[PDB]
Amino acid sequence: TGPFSIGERVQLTDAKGRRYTMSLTPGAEFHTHRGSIAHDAVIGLEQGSVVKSSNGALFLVLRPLLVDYVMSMPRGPQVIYPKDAAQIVHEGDIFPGARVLEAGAGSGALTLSLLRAVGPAGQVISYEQRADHAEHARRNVSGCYGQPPDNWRLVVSDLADSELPDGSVDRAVLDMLAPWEVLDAVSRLLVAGGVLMVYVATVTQLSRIVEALRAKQCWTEPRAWETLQRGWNVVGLAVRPQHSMRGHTAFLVATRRLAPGAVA
Ligand SMILES: C[S@@+](CC[C@H](N)C(=O)[O-])C[C@H]1O[C@@H](n2cnc3c(N)ncnc32)[C@H](O)[C@@H]1O
Secondary structure, three states: OOOOOOOOEEEEEEOOOOEEEEEOOOOOEEEEOOEEEEHHHHOOOOOOEEEEOOOOOEEEEEOOOHHHHHOOOOOOOOOOOHHHHHHHHHHOOOOOOOEEEEEOOOOOHHHHHHHHHHOOOOEEEEEOOOHHHHHHHHHHHHHHHOOOOOOEEEEOOOHHHOOOOOOOEEEEEEEOOOHHHHHHHHHHHEEEEEEEEEEEOOHHHHHHHHHHHHHHOOEOOOEEEOOOOOOEEEEOOEEEEOOOOOOOOOEEEEEEEOOOOOOO
């Protein structure tokens, strides 16, 4: 992508790690607590450059990675965390060209990883039953690209009421309070062999969705797990895990769709 251009998102990091994000606009002045930075001074610079404020405070300038962008969007429905989005893409096998169904669009954080994984030849169909939440996702997804992707369909309705054709999606991902309520729709929509990933914060949700999947009888035995992420301090002889860590985000569940009338 080269040097910074107009319209681009830029991440600024001051001398003690606070991150600031802006959209480059000629003539605009970016304001922080360590001074102000002119957008005109950043437009044209190479990534990884250090700019100086109006008060001399030094700032590192970089293009945000998708994970940086997703974690700094406006307040709204809780975004999925990076370790979980990574495994949804990977264990959910979101392949190039896939047709993916998603429900809860929420803030669109997972949506952006799903769109990146399927690429221009694939498609993402996201349901968001709340109109207000949907506007957040729509705004966040467009803000990553500069415009609405043409391979993204956002449907403002309950997924349970979906009218899409049978077997029209290759992969499905659910992040909502009550995923068992949309399982009949998912079972109809997802093709044979298709992968379903479910993200649930509590063990009561976890048990209920795994048992609902088994009761529907058209799914492989569900696989359920959690991941814990722990940062490390690696400074001279002081090499040790960090003292604070996030204890939990949510559990993951993976299952695959059986063929019409198959058992095992
Ligand atoms: C936890 S948020 C999803 C966050 C999303 N994974 C992201 O990273 O931003 C759950 C979303 O699912 C939505 N929702 C819940 N049940 C739904 C249903 N049956 N159909 C469609 N949307 C639903 C909620 O309105 C909420 O916006």
